[PDB]
Amino acid sequence: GLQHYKIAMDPALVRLGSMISNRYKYFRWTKRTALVSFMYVVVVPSTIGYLAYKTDGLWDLRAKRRGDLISER
């Protein structure tokens, strides 16, 4: 509610903020854009999850001396 300092508000900068703010309203589904959404939301986390599952309990360093293995499974 209070007043601030005087600023050289740049309409190009002002309008660039409007589009970044309002970009969510113009998203559509395309051949490209579903592929991007599919890679980063589905495939990539599925890749980490698959590796996490496949290498869970597999290693343990705790006090493994010479002549013993890091692996446990």
Partner: protein
């Protein structure tokens, strides 16, 4: 009378005090802030008396009160090791949150002060109640005061933000509520002492895990569910933003210490690879986007999503180091996140009316004190040593790595990527030229109000960074109870 109930009522006196003075003394709006500020200091004093009496090596919940008047929904209060620092953090932050909006709130000062005082009573009750139905009663009760607070004192798009914080929380909680209700129908109660010693079928644990995890993944927030945070943490008033990033975010982390770890042991141990996939993807995506964020407040808000993943991975690490560092990380995050919002939302936005980083450049030429603190705060956000943020990140990351090496390693990229956006923000605002030429009017530096809320916030993160034994000491014995497992040569001693 329990000291714990003293904690819950003093803000109610403040609300009652604030609302009746106009019937006693056109009373000046300065007086009601004086009452609200003093009321929070009293809660801080009581919580400090409780810590000076607290025993760090006792399993029994402390500062409980006899009731012997059992109804269907009684309110029980308790303080053990895990919940006390969360209570301690809340009573430290709330005075600073009111001071941060000492001048910024102009209209409806009574309403703003009453909400925050109410908001304090509801937030303490979350860490103090002694059953899971009471936990849910107070973790969802904050929604109406937060809804009205945002849309009464918020930024331009406050209407969209208020609707996002209310409808994501409500939905996630309803999935949590279906799980809490299933537990109560099996155990016949929700009281922590009774409920913890109940076991559950493996299938029950898996389905109980979901609903609770749906709920805590919304309130963490993990990436892909985080759009309510970017709206409601930016459009909120500065005090509400401080409470929403220092206190409200940490109810879900504490809710793992009551609702997931002790009563769903098998379920957690088998579902960690989902959680670490979500957590690592969260760190990784929430860092790249905050690298490209133009709103200065949104960049600070969305770095919390980055850090909340690290201590979310530390509480699912089944390691005494991970669990402790996770509490330390969420404790330190409250100080540094609070300061960064003060720096962005309180010091820049007040002077300039804007939050676009395009308009800021080389403030170090004009604001030497602001540049100073805004640099320690940026280092703490980057987990630089001497900062409790570093100890929490280090201890969480060891626990995450020791539990799942690949996930902790993919979490360990945070050292590289949190410094990337924390210093890129620092050199764009403080450095990077003489001053932004869009300033047609020179800026005053930090006032004494600004200099002291930041001095406190960086004091806590630094002192507890040299000596984190102040928090670590009382955490040890009680957090031992939330581990799951046994050693072949130390189990079943006879």
């Amino acid at each position: 009378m329990s000291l714990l109930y003293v904690l819950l009522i003093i803000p109610i006196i403040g609300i009652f005090l604030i609302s009746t003075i106009d019937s006693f003394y056109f009373f000046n709006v300065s007086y009601y802030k004086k009452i609200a500020l003093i009321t929070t200091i009293l809660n801080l004093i009581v919580s400090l008396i409780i810590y000076i009496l607290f025993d760090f090596s006792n399993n029994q919940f402390q500062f409980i009160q006899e009731n012997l008047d059992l109804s269907f929904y009684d309110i029980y209060l308790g303080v053990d090791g895990v919940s006390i620092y969360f209570v301690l953090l809340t009573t430290i932050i709330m005075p600073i949150a009111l001071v941060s909006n000492w001048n910024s709130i102009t209209n409806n000062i009574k309403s703003y002060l009453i909400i925050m005082l109410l908001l304090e009573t509801l937030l303490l009750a979350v860490f103090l109640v002694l059953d899971v139905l009471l936990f849910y009663i107070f973790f969802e009760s904050i929604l109406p005061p937060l809804f009205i607070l945002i849309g009464l004192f918020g930024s331009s798009n406050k209407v969209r933000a208020s609707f996002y914080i209310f409808l994501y929380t409500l939905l996630g909680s309803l999935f949590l509520l279906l799980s809490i209700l299933t537990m109560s129908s099996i155990v016949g109660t929700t009281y922590f002492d009774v409920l913890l010693k109940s076991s559950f079928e493996y299938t029950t644990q898996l389905f109980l895990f979901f609903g609770i995890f749906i709920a805590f993944a919304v309130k963490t927030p993990v990436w892909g569910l985080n759009s309510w945070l970017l709206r409601a943490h930016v459009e909120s008033p500065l005090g509400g933003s401080i409470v929403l990033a220092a206190i409200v975010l940490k109810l879900s982390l504490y809710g793992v210490f009551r609702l997931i770890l002790p009563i769903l042991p098998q379920a957690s141990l088998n579902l960690t690879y989902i959680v670490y996939a979500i957590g690592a993807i969260t760190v990784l995506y929430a860092s790249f986007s905050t690298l490209r964020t133009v709103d200065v407040k949104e960049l600070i808000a969305y770095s919390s999503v980055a850090h909340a993943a690290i201590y979310l991975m530390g509480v699912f690490s089944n390691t005494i180091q991970g669990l402790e560092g996770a509490i330390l990380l969420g404790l330190a995050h409250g100080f540094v996140s609070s300061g960064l919002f003060i720096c962005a939302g309180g010091i820049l936005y007040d002077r300039t009316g804007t939050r676009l980083i395009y308009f800021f450049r080389g403030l170090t030429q004009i604001m030497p004190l602001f540049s100073l603190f805004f640099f320690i705060l940026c280092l703490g956000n980057a987990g630089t040593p001497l900062t409790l943020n570093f100890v929490g990140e280090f201890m969480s990351l060891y626990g995450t790595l020791e539990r799942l090496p690949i996930a902790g390693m993919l979490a360990s990229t945070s050292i590289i990527f949190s410094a990337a956006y924390s210093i890129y923000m620092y050199n764009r605002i403080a450095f990077g030229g003489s001053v932004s030429l869009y300033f047609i009017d020179c800026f005053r530096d930090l006032t004494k109000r600004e200099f002291f809320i930041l001095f406190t916030l960086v004091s806590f993160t630094v002192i507890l960074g040299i000596y984190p034994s102040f928090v670590l000491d009382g955490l040890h014995y009680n957090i031992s109870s939330v581990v799951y497992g046994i050693e072949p040569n130390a189990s079943y001693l006879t």
